[PDB]
């Protein structure tokens, strides 16, 4: 019938269960029911018998939440000394530290001594402040000879690599003999320029040696120059480990690299010759295209390891870096065809490069019917559809996404189908994607706003393909979407670029989220990402990394360029985020050009140089 199962809440939350359990034996197949047991269940957890909880997690065990009761009833278990049930019940993936340091405690007082030593150490290098639950398990650990000087040592060098100086320094007065170069770690982990101070840290001991190395590391992000400098003063003088020096050489060689300095090259050649850290191998020949070396970009592309020769990033630079060192050669013709073809950004660069149609290739999976009730009959589907229907889209979505930890390949994409049905574009694509079912364009490329998103985009005189993709990017069509900084909406405006534009163009300012409405979203983050796009003289490929890295940042990372190709400068953006971005809007605004027939190549011929 029509189920009032609001009563049931409104008594629960916050107060008593007399209307839930009159209505208990009423609601038997209403789907939502077990959120009602759920809470008058967890309001009574404490005197709950272990027979009555268990009976719970049997029967309802794949509700959304079940991890948290799983953590207040074992907390429980364990405070009480039933260890027990709870060693039945502790599971590891809930990844709930707490837990295991509890298990811990089980381990070291039930016969498991290697065990619990294991589970000790595993909890206790890590750079962070631990639970309360951690100190007891530290307690028992050090209380049986194992928290030697050696381990403080490490724990001290990963708190002051996190940035944790308050914990570093407790464990630093921790140290029976190593205090002076402990307190030295924190010092130049809070200012590693003091390295530069020679005389200061010359005590040939693997110590001094270790607290420089992290020094020298962190001063890498700042000033590599600097670092390869004192590197080169301290290599002959401390006695570092081979370890040590290779994670000093990478820290320095990146960042020496992403700053187009060509003495990374030598650095990351010797430190790692083997081609065995994929980030320093990708930066070298990044910074072999940055530099105009093809010759030695092609080369190293050829021994790339199977895992990265694999992908169509070094299909790509393998075929251009040849084109570009021998521009007579027959051979880059047959690479590109092999590239073009596949539907990613380098696909449409190979595309481009034989000057060939982009390959699409959109077909809608081919799922039984069968394996389709599988998923709209699932209990989970039930209950995020009833939610769905309510307005409560959170527990709909948070339903919808736990569904999906278990799902084969199959259902998530049956799971996708049915929520592209229902205008839910984001969770579509989220389980499409997850299914790893790719060519299914027309969930993983919707059209929603359509009609608003063309307006505004011919308002702005931009193209419209370039608007969706952006927003593809951006939110990808979650209309009432916020980020973990605060960006909101459609566009991912954050709140002064937007009072910023309304300013600007006389557009009407939002209430700083009113940009939940795709109407008004849409109006400012078209009228900005025209800013943009004319403050880089119309480029996209520049105008793109503006809009997710701002502006100063586009502009240090094309001094001093001079004629350089739109694929190498996108290929050597500093941040992966960006570069990633930006590939990906692109490639975007291909697939939605065919989509609106207003067809788009990858790059303009405006584009090509800067
Ligand atoms: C999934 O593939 C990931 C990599 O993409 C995100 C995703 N959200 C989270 C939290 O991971 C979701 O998919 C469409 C976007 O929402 C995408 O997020 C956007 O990422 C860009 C940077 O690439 C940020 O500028 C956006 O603010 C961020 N948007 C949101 C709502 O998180």
Same mark, same amino acid.
């Given at each position: 019938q029509r189920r009032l199962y609001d009563q049931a809440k409104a008594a629960l939350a916050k107060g008593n269960s007399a209307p839930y359990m009159a209505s208990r034996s009423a609601l038997?197949?209403?789907?939502?029911?077990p959120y009602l047991a759920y809470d008058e269940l967890t309001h009574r957890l404490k005197s709950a018998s272990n027979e009555e909880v268990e009976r719970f997690l049997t029967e309802? &065990?794949?509700? /959304?939440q079940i991890g948290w009761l799983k953590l207040r009833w074992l907390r429980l278990l364990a405070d009480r000394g039933d260890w027990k049930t709870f060693v039945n019940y502790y599971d /590891?993936?809930?990844? $709930?530290t707490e837990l295991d340091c509890l298990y811990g405690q089980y381990q070291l007082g039930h016969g498991q001594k290697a065990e619990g030593y294991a589970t000790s150490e595993r909890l206790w290098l890590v750079g962070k402040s631990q639970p309360a639950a951690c100190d007891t398990l530290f307690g028992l650990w050090q209380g049986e000879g194992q928290l030697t000087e050696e381990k403080v040592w490490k724990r001290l060098k990963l708190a002051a690599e996190a940035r944790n100086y308050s914990l570093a320094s407790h464990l630093a007065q921790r140290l029976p003999t190593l205090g002076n170069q402990g307190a030295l770690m924190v010092s130049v982990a809070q200012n /590693?320029?003091?390295?530069?101070?020679?005389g200061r840290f010359s005590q040939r001991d693997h110590a001094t040696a270790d607290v420089v190395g992290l020094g020298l590391r962190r001063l890498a992000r700042q000033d590599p120059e600097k670092a390869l400098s004192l590197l080169d003063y301290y290599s002959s003088a401390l006695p570092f480990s081979s370890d040590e020096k290779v994670a000093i050489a990478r820290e320095i060689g990146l960042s020496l690299a992403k700053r187009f300095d060509p003495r990374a090259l030598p650095l990351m050649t010797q430190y790692d010759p083997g081609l065995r850290d994929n980030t320093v191998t990708e930066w070298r020949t990044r910074l072999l295209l940055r530099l105009g070396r093809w010759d030695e970009a092609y080369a190293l592309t050829r021994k790339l390891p199977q895992d990265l020769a694999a992908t169509s990033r070094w299909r790509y630079w393998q075929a251009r870096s040849l084109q570009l060192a021998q /521009?007579? =050669?027959?051979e880059p013709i047959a690479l590109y065809q092999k590239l073009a &073809?596949?539907?990613?950004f380098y696909g449409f660069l190979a595309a481009d490069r034989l000057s060939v149609p982009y390959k699409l290739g959109n077909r809608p999976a081919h799922i039984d019917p069968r394996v389709l009730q599988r998923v709209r009959n699932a209990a989970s589907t039930r209950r995020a559809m009833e939610f769905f229907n309510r307005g409560e889209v959170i527990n709909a979505r948070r339903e919808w996404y736990h569904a999906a930890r278990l799902f084969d390949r199959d259902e998530l994409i049956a799971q996708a189908r049915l929520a592209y049905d229902m205008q839910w574009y984001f969770p579509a694509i989220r389980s499409i994607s997850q299914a790893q079912y790719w060519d299914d364009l027309d969930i993983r490329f919707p059209m929603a706003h359509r009609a608003t998103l063309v307006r505004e985009a011919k308002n702005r005189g931009l193209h419209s393909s370039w608007i969706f993709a952006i927003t593809r990017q951006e939110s990808? $069509?979650? =209309?009432?979407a916020r980020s973990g900084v605060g960006a909101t909406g459609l566009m991912q405006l954050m709140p002064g670029t937007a009072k910023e534009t309304s300013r600007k163009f006389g557009i009407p300012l939002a209430?700083?989220?009113?940009?939940?409405v795709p109407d008004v979203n849409i109006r400012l983050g078209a009228a900005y990402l025209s800013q943009v796009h004319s403050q880089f003289n119309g480029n996209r490929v520049l105008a793109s990394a503006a809009y997710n890295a701002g502006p100063g940042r586009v502009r240090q990372w094309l001094?001093?360029?001079?004629?350089?190709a739109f694929d190498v400068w996108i290929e050597t953006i500093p941040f992966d985020e960006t570069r990633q971005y930006v590939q990906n809007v692109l490639s975007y605004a291909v697939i939605y050009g065919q989509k609106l027939n207003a067809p788009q190549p990858i790059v303009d011929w405006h584009e090509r140089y800067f």
């Open positions: 038997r197949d209403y789907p939502l029911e309802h &065990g794949d509700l /959304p /590891p993936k809930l990844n $709930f /590693p320029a003091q390295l530069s101070q020679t /521009p007579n =050669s027959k &073809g596949e539907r990613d990808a $069509f979650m =209309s009432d209430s700083t989220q009113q940009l939940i001094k001093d360029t001079r004629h350089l």
